């Protein structure tokens, strides 16, 4: 039923990037893992939703 | 020996001259017909003609007038660098 | 004749709308029945004008 | 005589001129005149502009896409823009309905198709379904 | 012992010829990417306008094609490949049409690339392909089409 | 001649190299090149890295898990990363479609498979389904 | 045509260029010997081209091409007829 009604979508989990500055507790402006956002992401997974 | 040349436009407006009188317009009435004339480019009536102001409406009845000769006035500054050896 | 007068009118004008927000934007369906292959189609949006 | 109008008859010619890229001018009934064009570059598509006046240092034509229909082209009058004359200064234009008295002093309605003039500006009209000329005074405009 | 060559339907590329056929009144057939495959005709008689129909078949005595007015667009003709009805037909829906480039297996166990230049079918319906650089004809099962 | 490419044919060898732990380099079509690896330690699982450049004091490769499919390995080109040369400076790479005139001055399409060069940099090409060499000028790129 | 024009000279200065590299002088040491070079013609180290300055210190370095530099800025107006 879920596969029948859903739409194909890519799913990637989230995790805090190591680039977070230990003292201010806030991230670097530009690094490959996260492009300014304070959160990184894992490799995509395919799913229907 | 000219080394670098740059050209810059300060102003770009339209000035109207009367073919017969040879004067420039300075003022117009409610109907946009001429109220006054002046023989001075610096004091003449002007329509802005930078890129954003093209295709205006305020002076349609003026432009169509055959006695008037529109003129495109442009003011420029150019910078020329030189080298003259030792 | 009406140089110095107050004129009052009743008028009819054509109806006009603009889009302020989009509500229930995208609705989807993988239509497959009686098709050579699966197809994606966008169902009606709802607009708040 | 005056040659202010040079209407195109065949749409094939219109398309040929469009392939050449020359701008067109298409008339409308109780509506603004329009210009039409073929886009340059890789993708060829029809463009339109509501700007009629000539390109100038103070006036630049604005072009946009449109899904023009051949039905308008095949029906409405079409001209080369640069060759078009804005007006022909006569009392009754062509295709204008007038009432005239025939040769036997009987009155009939007609529409006008002629452009003739002397060198002073005196104009004459020849009516559809008629041969001889009719003056500005003889003809009478037929009210809608 | 085979049927004579069968021709592919040539898409008309230039607008001028398409209008010329349309002015003469010869029927066109347009494929729309989104909606459908349609016929286009300029109206008979003096009341001239463009007409569209979806009765995609030869005008049989028992199959009367029906027309309705539509404001066909120039851009529609340009972007969408168009055919003449007299050619586009079920008579040939060949998998690899003429001028198609394919990869074919050679006698030396090497896969070379060649273009189809002539097409004919045997009485059993199998399509024989003539390829550039080759003399004999080739079979559909032997071939491979490389896309992109 | 030049040996810039040493493609692996058998996946069994690829798995054997993976068991040895050497990094791989897998090509993609209209997409970024990727590196693949087997994880060390107790648990053995495939890892990937989007970092192509060599490990350095200013550049460290980033590895993450992935459920890689054998279908990509068996189909796509694979190389040992350290042995790979970034490019071979020729006009038409291998497996590039070109149009050439055959010996009887008849024109045919072909794809390229050869790497030969003198010591000056002059290159020659041998076409699939062909034997003799063809110059950079003789061949013509076939547009998509 | 030209309706009004005037030319004014903003600056007259001497600039230093290396004879070997051809790069102009960007920064110098305590005794005006070069420490940095730059390709820029205008950002180059410059000094007024006046006789008094010469007597007040070209003097210091050998890989040295002391070049003169002048700037012209021109104000002009046109009435382009139709
Ligand atoms: Zn980060």
Automatic annotation (TrEMBL), chain B:
Superkingdom field: Viruses
The protein, known as: Non-cytoplasmic protein
Taxonomic lineage of the native organism: Viruses, Duplodnaviria, Heunggongvirae, Uroviricota, Caudoviricetes
Automatic annotation (TrEMBL), chain C:
Lineage top rank: taxon: Viruses
Name recorded for this polypeptide: Capsid protein
Source taxonomy: Viruses, Duplodnaviria, Heunggongvirae, Uroviricota, Caudoviricetes
From-to range in the entire protein, with total length: 196 to 244 of 292
UniProtKB/TrEMBL annotation, chain E:
Source organism per UniProt: Staphylococcus phage 812
Superkingdom: Viruses
Protein name: Uncharacterized protein
From TrEMBL, chain G:
Protein name: Non-cytoplasmic protein
Origin species: Staphylococcus phage 812
């Amino acid at each position: 039923f879920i596969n029948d009604r859903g739409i194909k979508v890519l799913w990637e989990e989230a995790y805090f990037c190591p680039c977070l500055n230990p003292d201010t507790g806030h991230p670097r402006v530009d690094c490959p893992r996260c492009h300014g956002k304070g959160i990184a992401y894992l490799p995509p997974k395919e799913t229907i939703m | 020996s000219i080394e670098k040349k740059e050209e810059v436009i300060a102003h770009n407006e339209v000035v109207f001259r009367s073919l017969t009188q040879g004067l420039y317009v300075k003022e117009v009435d409610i109907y946009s017909d001429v109220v006054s004339y002046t023989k001075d480019v610096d004091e003449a009536l002007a329509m802005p003609n930078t890129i954003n102001f093209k295709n205006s409406r305020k002076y349609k009845k003026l432009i169509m007038n055959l006695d008037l000769e529109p003129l495109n006035k442009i003011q420029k500054v150019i910078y020329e660098t030189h080298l003259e050896g030792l | 004749k009406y140089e110095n007068h107050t004129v009052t009118l009743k008028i009819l004008m054509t109806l006009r709308y603009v889009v302020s927000d989009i509500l229930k934007e995208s609705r989807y369906q993988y239509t497959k029945f009686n098709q050579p292959k699966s197809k994606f189609e966008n169902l009606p949006q709802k607009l708040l004008l | 005589p005056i040659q202010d109008a040079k209407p195109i008859d065949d749409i094939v010619d219109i398309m040929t001129y469009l392939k050449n890229g020359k701008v067109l001018r298409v008339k409308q009934d109780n509506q603004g005149d329009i210009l039409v064009r073929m886009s340059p570059g890789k993708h060829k598509f029809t463009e339109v502009s509501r700007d009629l006046d000539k390109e100038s240092f103070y006036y630049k034509r604005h072009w946009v896409l449109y899904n023009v229909s051949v039905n308008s082209l095949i029906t409405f009058d079409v001209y080369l823009d640069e060759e078009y004359s804005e007006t022909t200064k006569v009392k009754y234009p062509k295709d204008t309905i007038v009432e005239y008295t025939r040769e036997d002093q009987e009155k009939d309605v007609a529409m006008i198709k002629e452009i003739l003039t002397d060198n002073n500006g005196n104009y004459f009209y020849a009516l559809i379904g008629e041969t001889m000329l009719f003056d500005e005074n003889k003809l009478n405009k037929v009210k809608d």
